[PDB]
Amino acid sequence: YSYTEKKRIRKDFGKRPQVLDVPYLLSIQLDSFQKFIEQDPEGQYGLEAAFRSVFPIQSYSGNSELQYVSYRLGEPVFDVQECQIRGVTYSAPLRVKLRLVIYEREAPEGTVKDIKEQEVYMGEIPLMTDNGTFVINGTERVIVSQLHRSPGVFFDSDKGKTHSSGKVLYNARIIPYRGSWLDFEFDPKDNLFVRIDRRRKLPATIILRALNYTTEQILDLFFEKVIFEIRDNKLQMELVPERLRGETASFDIEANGKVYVEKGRRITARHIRQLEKDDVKLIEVPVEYIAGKVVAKDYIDESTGELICAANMELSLDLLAKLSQSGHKRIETLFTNDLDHGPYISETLRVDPTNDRLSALVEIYRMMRPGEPPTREAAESLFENLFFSEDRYDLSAVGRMKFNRSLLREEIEGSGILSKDDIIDVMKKLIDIRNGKGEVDDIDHLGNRRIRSVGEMAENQFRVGLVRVERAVKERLSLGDLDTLMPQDMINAKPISAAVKEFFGSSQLSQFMDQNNPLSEITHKRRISALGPGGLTRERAGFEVRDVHPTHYGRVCPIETPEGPNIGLINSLSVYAQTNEYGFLETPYRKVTDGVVTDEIHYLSAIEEGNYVIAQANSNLDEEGHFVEDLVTCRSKGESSLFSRDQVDYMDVSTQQVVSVGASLIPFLEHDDANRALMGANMQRQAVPTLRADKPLVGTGMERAVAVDSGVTAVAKRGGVVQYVDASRIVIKVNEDEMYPGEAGIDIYNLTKYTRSNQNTCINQMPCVSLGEPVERGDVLADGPSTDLGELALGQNMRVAFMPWNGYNFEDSILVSERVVQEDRFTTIHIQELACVSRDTKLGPEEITADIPNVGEAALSKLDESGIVYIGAEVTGGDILVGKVTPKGETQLTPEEKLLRAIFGEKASDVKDSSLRVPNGVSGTVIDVQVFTRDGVEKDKRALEIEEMQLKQAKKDLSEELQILEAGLFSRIRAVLVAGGVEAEKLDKLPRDRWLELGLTDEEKQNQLEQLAEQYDELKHEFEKKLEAKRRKITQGDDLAPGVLKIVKVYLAVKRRIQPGDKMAGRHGNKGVISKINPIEDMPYDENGTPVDIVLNPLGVPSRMNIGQILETHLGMAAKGIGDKINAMLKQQQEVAKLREFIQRAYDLGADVRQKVDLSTFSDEEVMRLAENLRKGMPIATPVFDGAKEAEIKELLKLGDLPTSGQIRLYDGRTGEQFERPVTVGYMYMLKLNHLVDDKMHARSTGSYSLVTQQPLGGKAQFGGQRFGEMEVWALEAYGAAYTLQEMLTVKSDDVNGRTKMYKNIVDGNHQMEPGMPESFNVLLKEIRSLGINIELEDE
C-alpha cells in the first residue's frame, strides 16, 4: 500500500478483482503528437514521412534537382509560462538541411558542384504541452481527435426509398487518403456507372477503354465464353453441366443417344446430376436459340475482308448464316444468367457513346473541365494524374490494407496508387454482391471508421504546406543563375508557417480547452468528432451514423455524448480504448485458453473482435480460473447468448471498459435511466471548482486516476523526503536509488498559484504534504482545483433530504439552507482579465496619463501617480482601473456648454476620456497588473517599477534554486568524501566552497568526485545564462499589434458566493435552480437537532428514472455514519485499540469483496493520522457495474447505528411539529455548474445602436436588448396588443427619430408614441430603389 493511500483509503465494494489498472488517460494526445514531431529514419508517419514523399523536387527537366537531407527542431523561444502571459504561440523553429545538385549539360548524370545549404528556416511549428494542449496566443487550446471514413473500398446500398420501386441499388466507393474519389454505382436499369467525386455520372465501361481495353477484352474479362461449333450442318454446342441451373429447357435437349430432359422442364438437381455423371461434353442444337445470344469477340469474313459482327453485337438467325458460309467454325458467346451472373456490363457498352481510347479520355476530360475543348495532351495527362500519379494520389498504408482486405487478397501492403488490376477486381466484386455472392459493408462499423489525431492531421497540413512551396521551388530552379542562389532564396517562410498556423488558430478541430474542471480537461482531450475536414456534415447524415453501433463496446462510450443538435456526432473515448497501429479502434481482452481464463491480455481491433467469442465482464471463475458455471452469458458475432464452458475464446477485461472517464464517475450508474445518465456525465464537466476541495462521500474508484492524469495536480517525479514546504514551492531530497550518479541534487516542484483559467475560473495548487514526509515515485505532491488528497472532488457533498418544502422546489428547483452559505463552502472564485489599450488614431496618440478631464481626486486615489490602479484594491462597478485619454481636439461645443465652461472655469480638454473602468455590478480584488509596451516607446513611471520588481523577484527565485541545489549537491560530496577519509569534525569547520581540492585514494570514488565537480561548474555557469535571458526577456520591447502603443492588463479575482439563479445538479442528471435560501431555524431537523442542508423534491426522481440518486443519498448517509462514529471515539481519545477494532470491521462488511486491509499499517503514528481523515465521513467506492448492492449498503447502515430505512422522522423547523411519515435523509454529492446567475442577468434601457441598422447592440457590454423574433410577434397578434406591437418594433428599436421623441416624453411623464417609419423598412426602400425598381408611397 502506498503513501498517499495510507493517508485515506476508499472503502471499495465490488467483487471482480482489478487485473489491469486504468492507463494514462492522456495517452492519445501525447502519443500522437510525439510521433509527428520526432526523427524517424524511415517512412512511418511523421514530418520525415511528408518530406520523403514530395522530395526530391526536380526542376522542369533542367536537370537541376533539390533533395531533402534532414530537419531539426529549435528550442522553444519562450517556455509555457512565458509564452502565455505575452501572447505568442508556443512554437519551435524548424531548421531543415537542403542539398542542391546540378547535372551537367548534357550529363550522364553527376554534378558540376553542389552547395549543401545549412538548415533553412521554414516557420515555427507549435509544440504540445506536458498535458496534451497547445498554446496559440497565450491561450490553451485542444485539438480534438477526428473520426472519418477509413480509406479503402466500400460497397454500399441505398435500399428502399430509392425511386419508389423498392428494387434497391448497390454502389461502391473508393475513398483514398489523398486524391480524387472513385464511385461505382448502379441505377434502376442495372447499368453500371462510375462518377469521380460527386460529379457527372458516366457509363462505367468508359474507363476500360481508357486503360486500353477494347470491346473484345471487356467481354473476355467480365464474362465467360459459350463455344458454338458448326460441325456438319447447323449447330452443335459445348455444354457446361452447371450452366443450366436456374432456367428452364428451351427445346428437346438430348445427347449421347438418350434424351435426358424434354422441352418445358426446369433443369434442376436431377437433370444436372445426369449430365455430370454421364459426362456430356458436346451437344447438337437448333439454329433459333442464337437469335438472342451476344457474340463475344470480333469475327470477320475471310473472303471479302468485311466485318461480319463487331464484338458485343447480338446475333440473329440470318447473321449466323452469313458467317457460316465464310468458313467460321467457332462462334464465341457471352454467358448471361439473370439469377447468377447478370448481363450488366454488356448493356452499359450499348449506352456508351465512345468506342476507342481517346474517345473516352476526352469524355473524361470534358466531364471534369466542361466549357473548354479537349486535347490529346490534355485528356492523356488528366487521366494519368487522377488515380495513377504518385503525387496526386495515395491510398496510404491503411487504404491499401482495407482495400486488399475487402477483396480477399493476401498482401497487406502494396501499391500506393490504383492499378488496372485494382479497378477490375473492384468492378468484379461490385457485380458479385448484386449477384448474391458476398455481402455489403456498413459505414457505421468501427472497422471502416478510422481515428486520426493531431500528429497525423498536422502531417497533412505540412504536406499541403510543401505542395504549395514545391511549385515555387520548381519555378526558381528554372531560370536560376550559377553559384548565387542557394536553397534558401527560393523557400519562403510565411507559406509554410501560415498553412499550419491556419489549423491551430481557427479550425473546427482546434478549440479553447474546456478547463473549468480536471474532468473537463481530460474529457475534452479524449473526445471524438465526425465533423470538419473529410467527415460527414450535420446537414448530410443522417441517423445511421449518429446512432450507437454495436462496435462501440469497449472502444467508444455509449452514454457520454452531447445532448444538442449534434447527438451521436461526437462521443467520448472509453477508458481502456487505444488506437490500432493502422488507426482502428481496439480494446483489451483476456485470453481464455481451453477452459482456464488467463490474465495475458490481447488487443483486438474492431475487425479482429467479431470472429472470436468473447465472454462477459460479470462471470464467476474460481480456483485455477475455470468458468464456475457450465454456461455463461457471452457475446460472439455481433449478438449475445448462452455458451458452453469451453467455447469462450476471450473475456472482458473489466466491468468498466465500456464507458468513458466521465461516465465511470457516477456511482450506482447501473440503476440510472440511460437518458438521465447522459445528462449526468454531461453536467459533471460543467462543475465549477469550489473554494474548499471536498471529496466525494459516494465514489466509484476512478477519481484518483482522473486527478493524477489531468495536469492540474503536481505529481512527484522522484521518490524521497521533503526538505522544504512552501505555499509557493516544494523541495524533494531524492532517495539514493532513483538519484542519478552525477549532479546529485534535489527535485524542486514549483507550484501554480492563483491564475486565470480558460473559463475565468480560478486554478490554484495547494500543498498536500507536510515537512519531512516520506513520498514514493508517482505520489501526489499538491492538489489541483477540486481535487483532494489525490482524489477528484468536483463538488461538495451535503446532508440532503427528499420532501416537499412548501413548494420552494416546484419543478426541479433546489432549496438550500443558510448553513451552506455561512460556511462559505459553495463560494466560488473567479478571475477575469480586463485590458486597456493605448492606440494610435489619425488624430494622435492616446496617453495613459492620470490627468483625466472632469474627474475629482476621489478617482485618482485608487490610482497611483502614473495612472494605474494599485494592487490589492477592492473595487466595484464604476471604479476606474486604468486612466486613459485619447486625442480629441476642437470639440465644437454648443452655446450653452461654452457658457457653462465659462461659469465654472473648466479647461475643455483637447483630449477625450477613454479610461478602462470596472463593469457595473461585478466587484472583486485586484491581484495582478501586467504592462506590455511597444519596443521604443518610453516605459512610464509605474511600468519601470513593475519591470524592476520582476527583475528582483526572478533573481531571488533563481538564486534560491542555486542555494538549495548547492547544499543538496555539496551534501553528496560530504558523504562520498567520508568513504575513504572520513574526518567528520575536521571537514565541516573550513569553508564548504574550499572542498573541491580534497581527493581520494586509488578507487572509483576518485572518479565519482570528478563527476560531481563537472556538474558543479555547470550549475555555476548555467545560473549566469538563465539569469541573462530571463533579464533580457523582461526589458525587451514587448511586441504588440500595429497601431497599438502599450497595453495594461489587470487581472481581477471576484469571489462569488451562491444565490437564487445558479444551476446545480447531482451526478444523476437532476438539474435544478436554487429558489430560496432558508434559515437553519426553518430547516427540517431530527430528534438529535441536526438540520439538513438541502431539501430536494421527490417528484423529480420517479418520472426521470434516475434511481441512482437515491442509492447515492442512502450510501452517503451510511458513509457519514462511520464518520460520526469515529468522530465520537476520536474525541473520547479512546486509544488505538478501540479505534482500530471498529475501523477494521467496516472495511470487510458481509464478506466477498476485493478490498483487503490492515493490521500492517504502523499501529500508532500511521493509524492515528488516518482516523482524523475519516471523521468527516468514510469515502466509499461503488464501481460502475461492479457496484455495491442493497445488502452491503443496509449492512453499513447497521454498523453506523443508523436506520436501515435510510429514512428518519423529521421535524419542521418552523412549527416544530413532526413530519408525518419517514422522509429520506442522506448525503448526495452535488455540483454547482457555471450557469451562474450574475452572468446570465442582463438588462438594458437605452444603449448603443448598430450603425447599419439603428438597432440595440451590445457595445460597452451593456448588452443588446432581447431579440423579438417572428414567433413573439404572433403572440401580440393573438392578443389585441396592437400598440404593444407597434411600440415594440418602432420606438423600442428601429425608429431612429421615434426613440428619442419617446425617451424625452418618458421623463416628461407623457406616455405616448410618435411612431413614423422604422428605419429597417426605409433601407429596404432604398435597397429596392437602387435596383431597377420604382417603389413609391402613394396617397395620403
Binding site: 396592437a1282 400598440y1283 407597434q1286 417609419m1317 422604422p1318 429597417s1320 429596392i1328 425598381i1333
Partner: protein
C-alpha cells in the same frame, strides 16, 4: 393545400416575407401592383398599427 393557399396572397409585401423574395418583386414590379396594406404581416413590416 395550406402551403399552396398561402402562396396566393393579395398583398405582395406579405409574400416577399416568407416566399422566395427575388421572384415576388419581379413578378410584382412588372405588373405595377398596388398594395393597400389591409393584411397583418405587411403592416408589421412597415411598422404601423396591426
Amino acid at each position: 393545400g395550406i402551403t399552396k393557399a398561402s402562396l396566393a396572397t393579395e398583398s405582395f409585401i406579405s409574400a416577399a416575407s416568407f416566399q422566395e423574395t427575388t421572384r415576388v418583386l419581379t413578378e410584382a414590379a412588372v405588373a405595377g401592383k398596388r398594395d393597400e396594406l389591409r393584411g397583418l404581416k405587411e403592416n408589421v413590416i412597415v411598422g404601423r398599427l396591426i
